[PDB]
């Protein structure tokens, strides 16, 4: 399983979108849920973030979906 942001083996790229959502706020929440977080990048309509293929994330109030595609990034991905 490989990352769409970095090409890394061992990742699934999710997109994240929510009200009053930013990237640091995204990451804090994810860690707040016990998830291990890889590369992140903000995109034109939201955020991309790598989660473990095994991870089954459930943040209250946020919508988290695996990406089919990566489009309209706003920044280069990094950790
Ligand atoms: Cl499942």
Q: For the residues of 21-54, what is the DSSP string, one character each? A: --HHHHHHHHHHTT--EEEEEEETTEEEEEE-TT
36 is in an annotated binding site: no
Quote the CA–CA distance of 23 and 18 in Å, as a whole number.
11
Domain containing 2 equals 1-79
Experimental method: X-ray
Q: Separation of 63 CA from ligand 1 center, angstroms?
A: 16
Q: Separation of 77 CA from ligand 1 center, angstroms?
A: 27
Residue 14: closest CA among 72, 55, 44, 60: 55
The resolution, in angstroms to one decimal, equals 1.8
Q: What is the CATH number of the domain that holds 60?
A: 3.30.70.1800
Q: Separation of 75 CA from ligand 1 center, angstroms?
A: 31
Number of domain units in the chain: 1
């Amino acid at each position: 399983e490989r990352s769409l942001l970095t090409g890394e083996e061992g990742w699934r790229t999710y997109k994240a979108t929510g009200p009053r959502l930013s990237l640091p706020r995204l990451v804090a929440l994810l860690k707040g849920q016990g998830l291990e977080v890889g590369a992140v990048a903000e995109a034109e309509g939201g955020f991309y973030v790598d989660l473990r293929p095994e991870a089954r994330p459930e943040v209250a109030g946020l919508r988290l979906e695996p990406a089919r595609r990566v489009e309209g990034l706003l920044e280069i991905p990094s950790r």
